C-alpha cells in the first residue's frame, strides 16, 4: 500500500511513544472516533473515545495531534486530536465546555458513606476497607490521608498543594487511595480535576444505620440526625455519581467486589 509509505514517519513516532512514560492524563468531555478521522497521521490508528473516557498522553506530535492511549485493557498507542483539532471539528459541523480536563494518571479512590466521616459507624466501616486494600495491594498502592478540604479545589494554597501532591503520587501509576476527611458526597469533588473513583460504602437501610449508631453509645447517638441526613443524601444520588457501590451484607464480599474492580483498573492503566 502506498499509504504505508506516506505514514512511515508518523508510524515510527507512534512506535517510539509506545515505550515512553505517561506525560499527563485527560478525561474527555466529548465523543470522538479517530478510526474514521481521515486526516489522522496513520489511518485507523486514531483513539476512539466516548465522553468521560480517560486518555494517557505520552507525547505531543503537533499542534493538531498528540500520541497516547485510551485507558482501557487492550487500548493501544494511538493518535489523539489536540483540543485545537477538536474545536475545528466542532466548528466545522456547527457551521455546515473544553474537550479535555487534565486529571491525575490514576483516578484517586475515595470512599463515601454510609454516613458522615468523623463518626464511628462510617469511620470504622471505611477503616476496615482501607486496611484490606493496604494488605491486598501492598507494593502497588499509595494510600494517603488528606485533611484539607478538597471541595474548595479549583488557605486555598493548602488545598492546591494537596491537589498537586495527589497528582504527584499518581505519576508512578500506583493505585492511589485517599482518606479525604471532608468528602462525604460525590458532588463535593465533581468540580475538581481529581476525577476520583467514588466508592459508596452502603449499609442495609436507614433503620439499620440507626441501630448501628445506637450501638455506639450516647456520644454517637447525640448526632443521629446529621448522620441520617448524610445517608439520605447519598442514597438519593443518581447511579452515575458512584463508580462502585458496596452494598454487600458482609465485609469480605465488599472487599472482593472492590479488589476485583481495582484489579481491572490496574490492568487498564498498565500498558
76/192 same-domain check? no
CATH of residue 33's domain is 2.30.30.40
User: Do the Cβ atoms of 52 and 241 come closer than 8 Å?
Assistant: no
Instruction: Enumerate residues 6+ apart whose C-beta is below 8 A from 259.
Output: 132, 133, 136, 137
Q: Which of residues 104, 135, 161 is at a domain's end?
A: 104
15/48 same-domain check? yes
Number of domains in the chain: 2
126/239 same-domain check? yes
Q: Which of residues 104, 122, 144 is at a domain's end?
A: 104
Cα distance between residue 59 and residue 24, in whole Å: 9
Q: What's the maximum distance between 2 C-alpha atoms anywhere in the chain?
A: 79
User: Which three-class secondary structure state does DSSP give residue 94?
Assistant: coil
CA 163 vs. chain centroid, Å, equals 14
List helix spans (H) across the chain: 2-17, 83-93, 120-136, 156-170, 206-214, 218-221, 224-235, 251-269
Technique that determined the structure: X-ray
DSSP letters of 31-69?
A: -EEGGG-TT-SSTT-B-EE-TT-EEEEEEE-SSSEEEEE
Q: Which of residues 104, 133, 149 is at a domain's end?
A: 104
Q: How many residues are listed for the chain in this entry?
A: 271
Residue 64: domain span = 1-104
90/120 same-domain check? no
220/251 same-domain check? yes
144/80 same-domain check? no
For cell 469511620, name the residue: 123
CATH of residue 196's domain is 3.40.50.300
User: Do the Cβ atoms of 227 and 271 come closer than 8 Å?
Assistant: no
Shortest CA distance to 262 belongs to which of 181, 145, 178, 177? 177
Cα distance between residue 269 and residue 225, in whole Å: 41
38/16 same-domain check? yes
155/246 same-domain check? yes
175/160 same-domain check? yes
98/127 same-domain check? no
Shortest CA distance to 43 belongs to which of 89, 99, 2, 95? 2
Measured in angstroms, the resolution is: 2.3
Q: How many CB atoms lie within 10 A of CB 55?
A: 24
161/264 same-domain check? yes
User: Do the Cβ atoms of 143 and 135 come closer than 8 Å?
Assistant: no
CA pseudo-torsion sign 18, 264, 115, 234: positive
47/119 same-domain check? no
Amino acid at each position: 500500500s502506498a499509504r504505508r509509505e506516506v505514514e512511515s514517519q508518523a508510524q515510527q513516532q507512534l512506535e517510539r511513544a509506545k515505550h515512553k512514560p505517561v506525560a499527563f492524563a485527560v478525561r474527555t468531555n466529548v465523543s470522538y472516533c479517530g478510526v474514521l478521522d481521515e486526516e489522522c497521521p496513520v489511518q485507523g490508528s486514531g483513539v476512539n473515545f466516548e465522553a468521560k473516557d480517560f486518555l494517557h498522553i505520552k507525547e505531543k506530535y503537533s499542534n493538531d495531534w498528540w500520541i497516547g492511549r485510551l485507558v482501557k485493557e487492550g487500548g493501544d498507542i494511538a493518535f489523539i486530536p489536540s483540543p485545537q483539532r477538536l474545536e475545528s471539528i466542532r466548528l466545522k459541523q456547527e457551521q455546515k465546555v473544553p474537550p479535555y480536563d487534565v486529571v491525575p494518571s490514576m483516578r484517586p479512590v475515595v470512599l463515601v458513606g454510609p454516613s458522615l466521616k468523623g463518626y464511628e459507624v462510617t469511620d470504622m466501616m471505611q477503616k476496615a476497607l482501607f486496611d484490606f486494600l493496604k494488605h491486598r495491594f501492598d507494593g502497588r498502592i499509595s494510600i494517603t490521608r488528606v485533611t484539607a478540604d478538597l471541595s474548595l479545589a479549583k488557605s486555598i494554597a493548602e488545598v492546591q498543594s494537596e491537589i498537586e501532591r495527589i497528582f504527584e503520587l499518581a505519576k508512578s501509576l500506583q493505585l492511589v487511595v485517599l482518606d479525604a476527611d471532608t468528602i462525604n458526597h460525590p458532588a463535593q469533588l465533581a468540580k475538581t480535576s481529581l476525577a476520583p473513583i467514588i466508592v459508596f460504602v452502603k449499609v442495609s437501610s436507614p433503620k439499620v444505620l440507626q441501630r448501628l449508631i445506637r450501638s455506639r453509645g450516647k456520644s454517637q447517638m447525640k448526632h443521629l440526625t446529621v448522620q441520617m441526613m448524610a445517608y439520605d443524601k447519598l442514597v438519593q444520588c443518581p447511579p452515575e455519581s458512584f463508580d462502585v457501590i458496596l452494598d454487600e451484607n458482609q465485609l469480605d464480599d465488599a472487599c472482593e467486589h472492590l479488589a476485583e474492580y481495582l484489579e481491572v483498573y490496574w490492568r487498564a492503566t498498565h500498558h
